[PDB]
Tab-separated table of C-alpha atoms in Angstrom:
chain	number	residue	atom	x	y	z
A	2	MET	CA	0.000	0.000	0.000
A	3	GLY	CA	1.782	3.148	-1.315
A	4	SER	CA	-1.227	5.369	-0.479
A	5	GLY	CA	-1.739	6.701	3.111
A	6	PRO	CA	-4.897	7.615	5.207
A	7	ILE	CA	-6.076	11.085	6.452
A	8	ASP	CA	-5.709	12.667	9.951
A	9	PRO	CA	-9.309	12.934	11.440
A	10	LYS	CA	-8.111	14.297	14.842
A	11	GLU	CA	-7.192	17.872	13.730
A	12	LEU	CA	-10.891	18.441	12.766
A	13	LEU	CA	-11.899	18.081	16.494
A	14	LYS	CA	-8.520	19.418	17.783
A	15	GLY	CA	-9.458	22.799	16.173
A	16	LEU	CA	-11.713	23.173	19.297
A	17	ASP	CA	-8.672	22.407	21.612
A	18	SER	CA	-7.551	26.049	21.028
A	19	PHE	CA	-10.692	27.134	23.034
A	20	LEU	CA	-9.382	24.944	25.953
A	21	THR	CA	-6.007	25.247	27.789
A	22	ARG	CA	-2.725	24.353	25.921
A	23	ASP	CA	-2.551	20.898	27.648
A	24	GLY	CA	-6.141	20.169	26.439
A	25	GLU	CA	-7.632	20.139	29.968
A	26	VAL	CA	-10.378	22.831	30.137
A	27	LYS	CA	-10.537	26.638	29.811
A	28	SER	CA	-13.884	27.582	31.424
A	29	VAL	CA	-17.555	26.628	32.057
A	30	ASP	CA	-18.141	28.272	28.594
A	31	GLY	CA	-15.552	25.803	27.214
A	32	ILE	CA	-17.361	22.652	28.489
A	33	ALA	CA	-20.720	23.830	26.965
A	34	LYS	CA	-19.446	24.304	23.342
A	35	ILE	CA	-17.555	20.948	23.655
A	36	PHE	CA	-20.760	19.392	25.115
A	37	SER	CA	-22.984	20.266	22.117
A	38	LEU	CA	-20.398	19.128	19.465
A	39	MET	CA	-19.333	15.856	21.304
A	40	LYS	CA	-23.091	15.104	21.821
A	41	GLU	CA	-23.301	14.448	18.025
A	42	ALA	CA	-20.767	11.612	18.619
A	43	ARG	CA	-21.018	10.545	14.915
A	44	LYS	CA	-17.179	10.313	14.572
A	45	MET	CA	-15.157	7.612	16.499
A	46	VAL	CA	-12.321	10.185	16.773
A	47	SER	CA	-14.815	12.836	18.166
A	48	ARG	CA	-15.577	10.226	20.868
A	49	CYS	CA	-11.962	9.502	21.980
A	50	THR	CA	-10.665	13.140	21.584
A	51	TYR	CA	-13.384	15.025	23.559
A	52	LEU	CA	-13.786	12.274	26.294
A	53	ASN	CA	-9.971	12.559	26.834
A	54	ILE	CA	-10.357	16.381	27.223
A	55	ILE	CA	-13.230	15.851	29.805
A	56	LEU	CA	-10.891	13.322	31.499
A	57	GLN	CA	-8.122	16.020	31.653
A	58	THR	CA	-10.754	18.597	32.832
A	59	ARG	CA	-9.241	18.938	36.370
A	60	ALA	CA	-11.886	21.573	37.370
A	61	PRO	CA	-14.500	19.495	39.460
A	62	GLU	CA	-17.290	22.176	39.124
A	63	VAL	CA	-17.092	21.823	35.309
A	64	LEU	CA	-17.705	18.021	35.774
A	65	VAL	CA	-20.779	18.302	38.090
A	66	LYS	CA	-22.429	20.877	35.741
A	67	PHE	CA	-21.527	18.585	32.737
A	68	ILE	CA	-23.711	15.944	34.499
A	69	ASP	CA	-26.393	18.675	35.063
A	70	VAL	CA	-26.610	20.126	31.473
A	71	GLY	CA	-27.372	16.675	29.924
A	72	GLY	CA	-24.002	14.869	30.159
A	73	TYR	CA	-25.491	12.368	32.689
A	74	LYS	CA	-27.859	10.910	30.019
A	75	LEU	CA	-25.098	11.195	27.367
A	76	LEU	CA	-22.671	9.052	29.507
A	77	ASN	CA	-25.259	6.189	29.438
A	78	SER	CA	-26.031	6.990	25.735
A	79	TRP	CA	-22.368	6.736	24.583
A	80	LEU	CA	-21.840	3.660	26.874
A	81	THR	CA	-24.694	1.803	25.053
A	82	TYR	CA	-23.639	3.268	21.624
A	83	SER	CA	-20.069	1.928	22.090
A	84	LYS	CA	-21.252	-1.427	23.604
A	85	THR	CA	-23.143	-2.287	20.330
A	86	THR	CA	-19.798	-2.409	18.416
A	87	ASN	CA	-17.965	-3.165	21.764
A	88	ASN	CA	-14.954	-0.972	20.830
A	89	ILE	CA	-12.406	-1.721	23.648
A	90	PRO	CA	-10.327	1.673	23.687
A	91	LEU	CA	-13.703	3.544	23.561
A	92	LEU	CA	-15.545	1.618	26.416
A	93	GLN	CA	-12.563	2.047	28.801
A	94	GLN	CA	-12.381	5.843	28.065
A	95	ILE	CA	-16.158	6.397	28.694
A	96	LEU	CA	-16.079	4.608	32.093
A	97	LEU	CA	-12.742	6.407	32.941
A	98	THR	CA	-14.303	9.853	32.114
A	99	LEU	CA	-17.329	9.122	34.410
A	100	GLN	CA	-14.743	7.756	36.949
A	101	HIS	CA	-13.131	11.258	36.711
A	102	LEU	CA	-16.421	13.082	37.576
A	103	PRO	CA	-18.000	12.477	41.097
A	104	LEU	CA	-21.003	10.203	40.239
A	105	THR	CA	-23.662	9.286	42.914
A	106	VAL	CA	-25.467	5.984	43.836
A	107	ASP	CA	-28.678	7.670	42.520
A	108	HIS	CA	-26.989	8.127	39.099
A	109	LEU	CA	-25.403	4.629	38.609
A	110	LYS	CA	-28.685	2.953	39.746
A	111	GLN	CA	-31.062	5.113	37.635
A	112	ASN	CA	-29.169	4.750	34.286
A	113	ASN	CA	-28.363	1.069	35.314
A	114	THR	CA	-24.700	1.774	34.272
A	115	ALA	CA	-23.660	0.195	37.659
A	116	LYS	CA	-24.843	-3.176	36.249
A	117	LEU	CA	-23.381	-2.512	32.734
A	118	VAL	CA	-19.869	-1.671	34.077
A	119	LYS	CA	-19.966	-4.406	36.789
A	120	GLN	CA	-20.641	-7.261	34.273
A	121	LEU	CA	-17.507	-5.910	32.443
A	122	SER	CA	-15.464	-6.058	35.735
A	123	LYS	CA	-16.990	-9.540	36.478
A	124	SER	CA	-15.638	-11.193	33.290
A	125	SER	CA	-14.932	-9.547	29.906
A	126	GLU	CA	-12.558	-11.077	27.268
A	127	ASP	CA	-10.105	-8.135	27.678
A	128	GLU	CA	-7.781	-6.995	30.532
A	129	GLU	CA	-7.578	-3.163	30.158
A	130	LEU	CA	-11.326	-2.337	29.923
A	131	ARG	CA	-12.327	-4.418	33.024
A	132	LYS	CA	-9.337	-3.462	35.259
A	133	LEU	CA	-10.158	0.284	34.693
A	134	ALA	CA	-13.841	-0.736	35.277
A	135	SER	CA	-12.672	-2.569	38.455
A	136	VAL	CA	-11.057	0.651	39.875
A	137	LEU	CA	-14.341	2.445	38.988
A	138	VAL	CA	-16.671	-0.122	40.703
A	139	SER	CA	-14.249	-0.301	43.732
A	140	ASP	CA	-14.508	3.524	43.996
A	141	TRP	CA	-18.320	3.212	43.719
A	142	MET	CA	-18.567	0.318	46.274
A	143	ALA	CA	-16.326	2.351	48.667
A	144	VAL	CA	-18.941	5.183	48.450
A	145	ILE	CA	-21.884	2.675	48.683
A	146	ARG	CA	-20.325	0.898	51.743
A	147	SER	CA	-19.869	4.361	53.341
A	148	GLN	CA	-23.613	5.137	52.600
A	149	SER	CA	-24.556	1.721	54.125
A	150	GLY	CA	-22.661	2.395	57.379
A	151	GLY	CA	-19.552	0.231	56.990
A	152	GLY	CA	-18.077	-3.225	56.327
A	153	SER	CA	-14.582	-4.815	56.097
A	154	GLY	CA	-14.134	-6.266	52.554
A	155	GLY	CA	-10.345	-6.496	53.140
A	156	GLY	CA	-9.349	-6.240	49.462
A	157	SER	CA	-7.688	-9.675	49.148
A	158	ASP	CA	-9.802	-12.944	49.192
A	159	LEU	CA	-12.662	-10.596	48.120
A	160	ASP	CA	-15.089	-12.547	45.869
A	161	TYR	CA	-17.259	-11.364	42.898
A	162	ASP	CA	-20.430	-11.852	45.060
A	163	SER	CA	-18.928	-9.901	48.062
A	164	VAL	CA	-18.175	-6.901	45.716
A	165	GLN	CA	-21.956	-6.469	44.962
A	166	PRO	CA	-23.231	-4.036	47.792
A	167	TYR	CA	-25.789	-2.196	45.533
A	168	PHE	CA	-24.696	-4.229	42.425
A	169	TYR	CA	-26.794	-7.277	43.615
A	170	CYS	CA	-28.993	-8.388	40.707
A	171	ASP	CA	-31.207	-11.012	42.483
A	172	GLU	CA	-32.231	-12.675	39.153
A	173	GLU	CA	-33.179	-16.058	40.675
A	174	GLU	CA	-32.394	-18.809	38.185
A	175	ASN	CA	-33.310	-20.995	41.232
């Protein structure tokens, strides 16, 4: 193959000028223009580029208002949209971006994304997606255990059933 492809990243990286030079976040104005254009989500590169910027968005107020302005529904939307094709570098970035923002038990339960990410960190055919998903669900179950009152867990010898505090799907096959 003497012919080469085309760079699709620069098309979405034109917006990176409206963020900081490291591609983190400029302002609450910055997240909103990104929000509307990444919402379209019709390019695979638009997915990975903007989600990486929201990941590098180290301003926690910008994250909680991202959830507020519609990003909450869009996290579940893009999760399902990526799970159809099951694109490994995409799935792991979506769950890592919502791992970056402070998400509540109300949220993960309502959108059912708690179940969707937990079945990944139970047994998927890939290391990197489920180990990032494992850090995410361990963060979530730390919060959930703290909302419950307490519990040991330990960390080691800790089984897939004993890491289900509000992840218990009581679907009785019995």
